Symmetry: C3
Subunit: 218 residues, 3 copies
């Protein structure tokens, strides 16, 4: 939301976008590790959801790295969003139900709204309604995160949707928190378009994720 159709002639990545259009898949993923020692302890002490702690860190970080908010819309236009929200499949008794959760820089506002959304899903709600709304609208002004807190991994890969259009928005996976040499760490993976996002931008994003996880634990 708060979208800008990019002036590609003035855009610093015009050459990158043109180069990567010719590829069957220009998307790629990186799995890293995030230190969560302090946040794991703090979320437990506060009787709060650790999932929402790192979900806040992830969506805030995406809203502080410009390159993570570029999309190719359903008409092929390069668009930049001043704001992106986060969608996540929430485990449901028996399946998953995907919720769209708004970003607020104020952690207390974010946490309450998100907890209400993941606790109070409508009983008559389509578990895949959020994705269908996003696809029909065609802006893709979100990032998507799947939580797998029981699976430790050092790598995960993602699907290839269409040749020339490998994905529609950044995808992420967060895995099990594990101990190593006195720290608690969890694996975090992200899938992005090379046309929009380089390693330097991912470095900034991962740094902010770890930084804000620490910040909300004090």
């Amino acid at each position: 939301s708060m979208k800008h159709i990019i002036d590609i002639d003035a855009w610093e990545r015009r050459d990158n976008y043109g180069f990567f259009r010719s590829f069957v898949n220009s998307w790629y993923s990186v799995t890293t590790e995030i230190d969560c020692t302090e946040a794991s302890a703090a979320a437990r002490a506060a009787k709060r959801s650790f999932f929402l702690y790192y979900l806040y860190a992830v969506v805030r970080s995406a809203n502080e790295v410009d390159e993570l908010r570029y999309r190719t819309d359903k008409e092929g236009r390069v668009v930049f969003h001043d704001r992106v929200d986060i969608i996540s499949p929430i485990a449901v008794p028996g399946t998953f139900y995907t919720v769209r959760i708004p970003y607020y820089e104020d952690f207390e506002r974010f946490y309450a709204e998100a907890y209400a959304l993941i606790t109070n899903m409508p009983e008559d709600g389509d578990p895949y309604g959020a994705e269908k709304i996003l696809a029909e609208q065609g802006d893709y002004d979100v990032v998507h995160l799947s939580a797998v807190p029981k699976m430790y991994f050092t790598s995960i890969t993602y699907t290839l949707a269409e040749a020339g259009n490998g994905c529609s928005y950044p995808l992420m996976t967060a895995g099990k928190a594990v101990s190593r040499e006195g720290r608690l760490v969890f694996p975090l993976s992200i899938y992005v378009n090379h046309a929009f996002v380089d390693g330097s931008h991912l470095t900034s994003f991962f740094g902010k994720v770890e930084e804000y996880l620490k910040e909300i634990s004090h």
Copy 2:
């Protein structure tokens, strides 16, 4: 035996239909498996550690239903009550892929598998087993590649055809390394999202580690 699935009654009908439209609906996960006890036990027994974790892997695939769904060569969803395991066995100076039958009885599995990997035909196509499987078109196997001298934290897999990224689960096992007094090895698996979610892989990995411990 083999079962042609009644897709109208199948709980994954919507998942299967959704992932048919993808160029590649297959994905891989690399994790690590604790093998401290099994490595020590295999050495004490003068036995093949490779066959220890090969057993653990194929048993686990035979205890997670979702790992035995295939799309056959006619496009049908089929479910196998049991799948065997194929593996490229190194031949000094290439490799030869052997099909090894699964038995829950570990001593039977170990004996039959050791016999198969010791008596391989010398004038063998490194991919002949794959060609036999392709002609039959049922894909009642899983595939594991052993690289005991290569430590890795990630490996990716090939994309065969658009709309059909692979024909059966593929796996890779790497070097056992020390981690805070324990021994772990990396294990990677490639599966179809149409058939296998993260919960199923979690069950699979847990069973691999469990059965490695049990046979020790």
Copy 3:
């Protein structure tokens, strides 16, 4: 020197054949490389650690034959006696440089530093790729340096169905402490038609070896 391979006499005939039908026969591996001594030595010399492991990587590629097989622009399998290394160098407010391998580390370091210092200000970020594409031999390997990003996995692009990439791609990440040592993640993307796990094992071993050697 470039050599057009006689596929009928080639020991990997069965492999190039098994993999031509694939949409993508390329795959990547991420491993860990011990860099304790070389990182210390580069710091003591007030020198670029980047060029230390760039030397180790390009030397190792020039000592593993399988990493120098390419499909040229005309579809021919070709083998290069030597390959250079191309790398995107970050530029104030990037430029891909081609750096030749020289066995003398001091010579390599001086030439690479000079090559990176005399980069054109008006240089096309993809000029190296365009020269390479027009020539069509692909006698290079490509390495991307991300020294501030720790990773355990990275994946790579798929260029064309049936031609997933034109030369090996690599990524080197942030050095971290593990079990008392300093290690950094190193990833490589290669064609299964040309490169198996054993070749990657030899390559990774040589990378670690030459990092130690040039630290003296």
